[PDB]
Amino acid sequence: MLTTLIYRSQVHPDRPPVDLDALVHRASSKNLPLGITGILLFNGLQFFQVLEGTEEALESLFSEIQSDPRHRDVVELMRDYSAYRRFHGTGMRILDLRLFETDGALEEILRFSTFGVTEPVNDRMFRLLSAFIADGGRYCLPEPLQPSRWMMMAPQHLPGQPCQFALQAIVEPAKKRVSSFEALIRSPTGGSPVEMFAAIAAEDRYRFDLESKAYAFALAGQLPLGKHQLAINLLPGSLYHHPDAVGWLMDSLLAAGLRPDQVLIEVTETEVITCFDQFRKVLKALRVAGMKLAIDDFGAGYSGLSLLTRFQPDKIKVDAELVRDIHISGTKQAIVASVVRCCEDLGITVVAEGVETLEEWCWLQSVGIRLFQGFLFSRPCLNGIGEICWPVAR
Amino acid sequence: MLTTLIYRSQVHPDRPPVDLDALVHRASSKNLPLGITGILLFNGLQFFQVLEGTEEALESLFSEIQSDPRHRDVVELMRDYSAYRRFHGTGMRILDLRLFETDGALEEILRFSTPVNDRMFRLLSAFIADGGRYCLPEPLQPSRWMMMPATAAPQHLPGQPCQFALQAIVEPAKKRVSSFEALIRSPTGGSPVEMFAAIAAEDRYRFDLESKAYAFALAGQLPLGKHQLAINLLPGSLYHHPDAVGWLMDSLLAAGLRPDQVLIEVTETEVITCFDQFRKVLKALRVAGMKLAIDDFGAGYSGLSLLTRFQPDKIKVDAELVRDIHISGTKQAIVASVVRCCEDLGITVVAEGVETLEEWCWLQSVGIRLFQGFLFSRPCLNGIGEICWPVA
Ligand SMILES: Nc1nc2c(ncn2[C@@H]2O[C@@H]3COP(=O)(O)O[C@H]4[C@@H](O)[C@H](n5cnc6c(=O)[nH]c(N)nc65)O[C@@H]4COP(=O)(O)O[C@H]3[C@H]2O)c(=O)[nH]1
Ligand SMILES: Nc1nc2c(ncn2[C@@H]2O[C@@H]3COP(=O)(O)O[C@H]4[C@@H](O)[C@H](n5cnc6c(=O)[nH]c(N)nc65)O[C@@H]4COP(=O)(O)O[C@H]3[C@H]2O)c(=O)[nH]1
Ligand SMILES: Cc1cc2nc3c(=O)[nH]c(=O)nc-3n(C[C@H](O)[C@H](O)[C@H](O)COP(=O)(O)O)c2cc1C
Ligand SMILES: Cc1cc2nc3c(=O)[nH]c(=O)nc-3n(C[C@H](O)[C@H](O)[C@H](O)COP(=O)(O)O)c2cc1C
Ligand SMILES: [Ca+2]
Ligand SMILES: [Ca+2]
């Protein structure tokens, strides 16, 4: 079955320039008997390749290409089924963009290429080609943000309590600064939030979720606290199945020596979406009281920034599924960069969570993320502040 | 109940400089007895104002401000309930941003106000850093444009269980018609709601699919040419007989049309509820060669997570996001982000329900080039309607 594969990559500027002549001669000669067609674009620093052929033949070739030491930062942009070949000729075509001016490159592409009965601008492949020609260095990973240039550098449990809390830090690595702490619920035996809520009767889970926060506020009250935000997770139901849940949280946090502005509530969009008029009453009560709110797991389940027409949170936490393998996904790169920009324009804080690798941290930083949560920096610490690992040079 | 109101605006660059001394002086003197506080930022071309006070007082004030001839392009950025007054003891005060060094303006603000964890402060920072971002350019001012006149030919086609109205999707910068969208009508000329209500509930999926033959027949006889044909389908009507894609393929080819010429429109709200069955339809569409568009993008608040699963050829920005975009900083930020994301992904963006020049101008400023709405073209029963173009 005919398939299209589109990727971008970049060269090593430190090494001798790649023989473009030998590359394209051997490519075109290998591709032809395998039924592989397409075009290669080169701007002096970046490669852009469109590959056409069977799914099995493109998977075999991309594996060899990803593995090729001539280039790095290989980012897949498109991979889908096709009805016709766009490129024709007994081999791989190549354009050195540096030697074309203004729109001569798009002119040479359109010489031998077929884009159907409608205008070429109606083809996604052509639009992706145009975007690389007009502005290719856009998602080119900067040299200081190359992952290869980076490397990475006590408290007891409480079984007597009905619940305990683990703390995970939100960090800003550029200033080596802890931004805030998120409280994660744990069972008396140190079990997960799943295990904890499973032990609670279903009709009592909303009330338990709200009242467990008294133990989170108390813990935060005994810690070197001072002036970091405390994020707590709540179901929206737990907030409005109660006569004054906002006022209850208010009394509970103030008795622990915390401030309204220091406490942030984390809810997801999936949880909120079914009940806007119910939630907007709760958010209003939170705002007036002085408490903050984040939209958590933004990317998982129902997620869109058109949600921001209903209300604007103080913070948006980008889901770990958008963060996962962002270094190779053109789709995830575009989406996260879009979130960063929208929130910057609206004055909404952005946190990327589930950050596990340097490659994730580096690419998230290139698209504008400054606040990070994940195992790479700091793991959740039961009833205390865990150690933070900072990325250092070399 | 305390409320915060934040907006930005632009001066008239060809008119004499307004005495801002007298403006702010009178403002501060009027604001304080009414329980209104805040500040004004000025960079030479743009204003940025924070207003604090009751919902009633700020409503009354902002209404006078919106009608004020001293400025234009008033864009509301924030309106929400507030915990406390950030500018207590300051009815109104102006800061000329050109009179400050790099962090100087922000440090002055903090010395007289009552902080990066505050949304108001972050919005203040954004205007100080890059305030010219959503500043509407001079050639894109609504007053610099005017719509043109011009002839349609609607025709009743008998012996059909349904008819189709055609509305053009246009590119005004090239005065070019991109595509035509087929909108179903009853044999009498009634709405899509009027048509489907006459069909039995369990036969509505089949009817939706089968009716498309009459849309292809229309398109082939209009000569179509190098134009796309957009058709509206329920996802359910696509995974329903086993050969639904193949049926549609046979029907369009017999009409003289090409696969790449036909685009399928499914709404964001209906797709998200059935990813699992839509996936096999997606494979068949791309093997066959037909295109896919996500319609009403934004209406189900799940467009971003949808682009994670699959990438359509086109998205059509919901008419609600287009509505009042000229005064909504929220919608301006959202649409501009969507446009930027789609540009990176190679997805075509079309704005829906474009009714006014104000909408078209601000849509243009955030990157949109394809437009659908009553401003340019109204739906025409079984034919190509007349198209109005904006002229400078
Ligand atoms: N794989 C991976 N995981 C990472 C990484 N960094 C952090 N995590 C983890 O992801 C979870 C936090 O995500 P969440 O969306 O808050 O998801 C949480 C949160 O929703 C939650 N939860 C925690 N406390 C409460 C609570 O008090 N009430 C409610 N309703 N939910 C809670 O239950 C979910 C499961 O939480 P946890 O076991 O505490 O697991 C934590 C955590 O350890 C990473 O780099 N990689
Ligand atoms: N206020 C305003 N409205 C504008 C403007 N421009 C276009 N419209 C209109 O909005 C509708 C097109 O949007 P839609 O989301 O496709 O909404 C359509 C579309 O979803 C639809 N529809 C049409 N044909 C079919 C069909 O064959 N099958 C299915 N399932 N739905 C269809 O039913 C809906 C109702 O369509 P219509 O009566 O044809 O009404 C059209 C149309 O006249 C504008 O500038 N301002
Ligand atoms: C940017 C770039 C594009 C490439 N394109 C192709 C290609 O289209 N076809 C191909 O066979 N090899 C291509 N290669 C080379 C392969 O990665 C790999 O070196 C080659 O398949 C090995 O073949 P050989 O050693 O048997 O000659 C490309 C390499 C780079 C860096
Ligand atoms: C940039 C801008 C900001 C303004 N801010 C205020 C304000 O904060 N308070 C106020 O009373 N008038 C403000 N005005 C003036 C009002 O639009 C309007 O002229 C005034 O409220 C009319 O009331 P008056 O006739 O009693 O002066 C502002 C005008 C402009 C152009
Ligand atoms: Ca959380
Ligand atoms: Ca439609």
Side-chain angles (χ1 to χ4, degrees), chain B residues 11-66:
Chain B
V11 305
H12 301 267
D14 51 44
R15 294 177 207 186
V18 151
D19 195 8
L20 295 175
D21 254 359
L23 192 152
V24 176
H25 211 71
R26 182 179 305 269
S28 182
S29 187
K30 194 182 177 190
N31 285 1
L32 207 79
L34 296 167
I36 306 170
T37 51
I39 60 169
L40 183 62
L41 265 49
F42 184 59
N43 64 10
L45 277 83
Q46 295 166 284
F47 288 111
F48 185 94
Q49 197 170 53
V50 178
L51 291 169
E52 306 181 305
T54 66
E55 191 184 303
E56 290 85 347
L58 297 193
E59 178 91 304
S60 177
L61 185 56
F62 187 52
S63 184
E64 286 171 295
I65 290 171
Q66 279 176 297

Side-chain angles (χ1 to χ4, degrees), chain A residues 20-34 36-37 40 49 51 61 65 70 90-94:
Chain A
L20 294 168
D21 192 59
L23 184 73
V24 73
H25 273 91
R26 296 169 68 85
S28 61
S29 183
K30 191 175 165 189
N31 288 356
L32 182 67
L34 298 173
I36 308 169
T37 60
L40 182 59
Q49 195 170 36
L51 288 167
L61 185 58
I65 285 167
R70 286 185 203 100
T90 46
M92 179 59 56
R93 298 189 181 275
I94 182 162

Side-chain angles (χ1 to χ4, degrees), chain A residues 228-258:
Chain A
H228 289 102
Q229 205 195 61
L230 176 75
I232 52 158
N233 301 283
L234 281 169
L235 291 162
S238 309
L239 290 153
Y240 41 68
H241 286 302
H242 194 286
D244 200 354
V246 164
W248 188 93
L249 286 155
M250 209 67 257
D251 291 343
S252 192
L253 72 91
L254 282 168
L258 275 53

Side-chain angles (χ1 to χ4, degrees), chain A residues 1 117 124 127 138-139 269 287 292 301 303-306 310 312 314 338 341-342 344-347 349, chain B residues 80 83 117 119 122 133-134 260 283 286 298 301 304-305 307 313 330 334 337 340 344-346 348:
Chain A
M1 307 194 88
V117 288
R124 178 156 186 253
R127 291 194 295 267
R138 194 152 146 183
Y139 286 100
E269 191 191 296
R287 285 272 150 87
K292 265 80 178 59
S303 284
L305 43 262
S306 49
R310 304 301 137 200
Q312 299 86 44
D314 300 284
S338 196
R341 197 57 146 205
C342 186
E344 181 188 298
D345 293 329
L346 291 173
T349 297
Chain B
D80 215 323
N117 290 15
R119 192 187 170 206
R122 290 190 296 263
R133 199 202 293 286
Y134 287 100
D260 49 287
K283 185 180 188 294
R286 297 284 152 89
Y301 322 106
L304 167 144
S305 64
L307 296 168
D313 296 277
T330 303
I334 295 160
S337 255
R340 192 74 170 181
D344 294 334
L345 294 176
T348 301

Side-chain angles (χ1 to χ4, degrees), chain B residues 2-323:
Chain B
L2 194 59
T3 300
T4 295
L5 191 143
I6 292 175
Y7 74 87
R8 68 160 93 88
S9 66
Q10 293 169 226
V11 305
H12 301 267
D14 51 44
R15 294 177 207 186
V18 151
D19 195 8
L20 295 175
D21 254 359
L23 192 152
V24 176
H25 211 71
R26 182 179 305 269
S28 182
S29 187
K30 194 182 177 190
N31 285 1
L32 207 79
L34 296 167
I36 306 170
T37 51
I39 60 169
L40 183 62
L41 265 49
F42 184 59
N43 64 10
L45 277 83
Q46 295 166 284
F47 288 111
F48 185 94
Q49 197 170 53
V50 178
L51 291 169
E52 306 181 305
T54 66
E55 191 184 303
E56 290 85 347
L58 297 193
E59 178 91 304
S60 177
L61 185 56
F62 187 52
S63 184
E64 286 171 295
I65 290 171
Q66 279 176 297
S67 289
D68 203 305
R70 295 185 199 107
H71 65 186
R72 62 182 185 182
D73 303 310
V74 177
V75 179
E76 185 184 317
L77 302 181
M78 180 184 177
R79 202 192 282 205
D80 215 323
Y81 294 97
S82 186
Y84 67 93
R85 215 172 274 267
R86 273 83 167 170
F87 296 106
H88 184 264
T90 304
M92 193 39 61
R93 180 168 167 162
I94 193 162
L95 282 309
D96 196 330
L97 301 176
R98 305 184 254 81
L99 264 49
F100 293 94
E101 292 275 42
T102 310
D103 314 321
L106 214 51
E107 285 166 348
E108 171 133 324
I109 300 318
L110 265 12
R111 282 192 295 270
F112 65 77
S113 68
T114 39
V116 79
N117 290 15
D118 202 294
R119 192 187 170 206
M120 178 199 295
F121 182 81
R122 290 190 296 263
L123 282 175
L124 277 160
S125 306
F127 185 81
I128 289 162
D130 193 19
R133 199 202 293 286
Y134 287 100
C135 194
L136 190 71
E138 283 296 317
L140 294 178
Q141 294 289 323
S143 56
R144 303 286 196 194
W145 296 88
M146 180 171 288
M147 301 302 301
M148 288 273 86
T151 307
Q155 193 185 30
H156 172 78
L157 292 175
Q160 292 192 353
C162 64
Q163 311 185 79
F164 282 90
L166 258 40
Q167 192 183 24
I169 287 88
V170 299
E171 188 174 11
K174 289 188 186 63
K175 290 195 176 189
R176 187 188 65 90
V177 189
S178 168
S179 65
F180 293 96
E181 189 192 357
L183 303 160
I184 204 170
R185 299 284 180 262
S186 76
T188 312
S191 64
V193 170
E194 212 166 323
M195 173 83 268
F196 280 99
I199 311 296
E202 45 269 287
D203 291 302
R204 277 171 197 160
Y205 281 134
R206 186 202 39 77
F207 182 79
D208 192 15
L209 186 74
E210 297 261 315
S211 64
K212 297 307 172 284
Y214 299 97
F216 300 151
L218 182 60
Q221 295 180 102
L222 281 271
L224 200 49
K226 304 176 194 289
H227 301 100
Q228 280 185 0
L229 175 76
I231 52 166
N232 294 281
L233 279 166
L234 289 158
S237 48
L238 288 154
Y239 47 77
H240 159 261
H241 275 49
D243 68 321
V245 169
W247 188 86
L248 220 61
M249 189 49 56
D250 292 358
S251 184
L252 70 88
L253 285 170
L257 314 175
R258 299 309 298 173
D260 49 287
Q261 205 167 30
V262 179
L263 170 138
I264 312 295
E265 276 184 36
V266 285
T267 54
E268 188 213 296
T269 43
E270 287 286 77
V271 173
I272 58 175
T273 60
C274 55
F275 276 123
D276 54 293
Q277 277 274 160
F278 201 60
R279 292 157 65 196
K280 203 71 193 295
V281 173
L282 259 158
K283 185 180 188 294
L285 287 167
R286 297 284 152 89
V287 167
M290 290 185 287
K291 302 198 190 302
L292 184 79
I294 298 309
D295 199 22
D296 297 322
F297 193 93
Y301 322 106
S302 184
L304 167 144
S305 64
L306 192 80
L307 296 168
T308 293
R309 308 300 195 277
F310 65 97
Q311 294 82 53
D313 296 277
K314 185 180 290 172
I315 64 148
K316 311 180 96 196
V317 180
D318 195 53
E320 178 51 45
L321 287 167
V322 170
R323 192 192 63 89

Side-chain angles (χ1 to χ4, degrees), chain B residues 321-328 331-332 335 359 362-363:
Chain B
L321 287 167
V322 170
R323 192 192 63 89
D324 282 9
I325 195 160
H326 63 291
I327 53 165
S328 175
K331 294 175 184 185
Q332 277 171 35
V335 171
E359 286 160 350
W362 283 86
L363 259 22

